[PDB]
Ligand binder design. Structure first.
Ligand code: CU
Ligand code: CU
Ligand code: NI
Length: 310
């Protein structure tokens, strides 16, 4: 969408609300599959809540976009290459826009807390450019996201539960390799409303479950070779103190001459499940992570759907 020029990136909406436009600074990629990142410091120091996102993408050039909150972006520059980087501290995903899979709105009453003493001080925007045939006129791209911020405290607070593999090894030619992740939940209740899967080219299927008294309840199941948007949960699912969260990525090693481990390049793999939730404001925390497998034997009773392509 058009570069903003003289009016700048901040639009006053109310005596308590404003829109912040986070856009690439007129970039022109020279190669296919280029990842550009840029950052924006929040204009306010006090606590604010992110309550809406509007995509400002070219429907010709942009393949996907992600928006993160963090305190230390990887570069102090105007823009940089980030094949998967973003920040030096923890990059907290807030929004995904995927071509051919339209985003779903935040439920009303729900917001991410940012700024203040403990919230993100920066937004970091990652834009993935696919086919660069539309850049033949050498035009400058200002694609990005418009974010609606308010100072009005929200009754429900949005957060992310990230489940990720660390130790996976996929030997070459191997028909099937499973990456299993599991943790005990020990916070106040969260309600999952959306999910995103992330794998590289070897991933076949990713599934996430809440396990309670041995019973498996589906959160999300998706082919990671399909556009990696945040997809809505079929049915709102609570996760409560005592529950186990379990996830499985199914990989193959076929077409590879050497072993494939977890890493940041296309020659490596990832097994990431992003579980987007809301919590009551007075109970809420903004992020949780599972990088372990605390109940490995539990996976004997995983539903069969977790083992076959969607
Ligand atoms: Cu993409
Ligand atoms: Cu990755
Ligand atoms: Ni409920």
């Amino acid at each position: 969408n058009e570069c903003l020029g003289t009016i700048g990136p901040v639009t006053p909406l109310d005596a308590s609300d404003f829109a912040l436009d986070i856009r690439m600074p007129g970039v022109t990629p020279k190669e296919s599959d280029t990842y550009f990142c840029m950052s924006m410091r929040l204009p306010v120091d006090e606590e604010a809540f992110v309550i809406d996102f509007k995509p400002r993408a070219s429907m010709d050039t942009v393949h996907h976009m992600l928006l993160f909150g963090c305190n230390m972006p990887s570069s102090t520059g105007s823009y940089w290459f980030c094949d998967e980087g973003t920040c030096t501290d923890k990059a907290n995903i807030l929004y995904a826009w995927a071509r051919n899979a339209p985003p779903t709105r935040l439920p009303k009453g729900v917001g991410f807390r940012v700024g203040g003493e403990t919230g993100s001080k920066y937004f970091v925007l990652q834009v993935h450019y696919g086919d660069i045939s539309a850049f033949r006129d050498n035009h400058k791209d200002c694609s990005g996201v418009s974010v609606h911020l308010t100072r009005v405290p929200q009754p429900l607070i949005a957060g992310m539960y990230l489940m990720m593999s660390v130790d996976t090894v996929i030997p070459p030619g191997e028909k099937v390799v499973n990456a299993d992740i599991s943790c005990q939940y020990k916070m106040y209740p969260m309600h999952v409303f959306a999910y995103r899967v992330h794998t590289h080219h070897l991933g076949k299927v990713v599934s996430g479950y809440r396990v309670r008294n041995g019973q498996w309840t589906l959160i999300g199941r998706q082919n990671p070779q399909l556009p990696q948007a945040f997809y809505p949960v079929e049915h709102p699912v609570d996760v409560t103190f005592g529950d186990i969260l379990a996830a499985r990525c199914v990989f193959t090693g076929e077409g590879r001459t050497e072993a494939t481990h977890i890493g940041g390049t296309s020659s490596d793999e990832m097994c990431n499940l992003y579980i987007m939730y809301y919590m009551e404001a007075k109970y809420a925390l903004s992020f949780m992570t599972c990088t372990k497998n605390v109940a490995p034997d539990m996976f004997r009773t995983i539903p069969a759907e977790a083992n076959i392509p969607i």
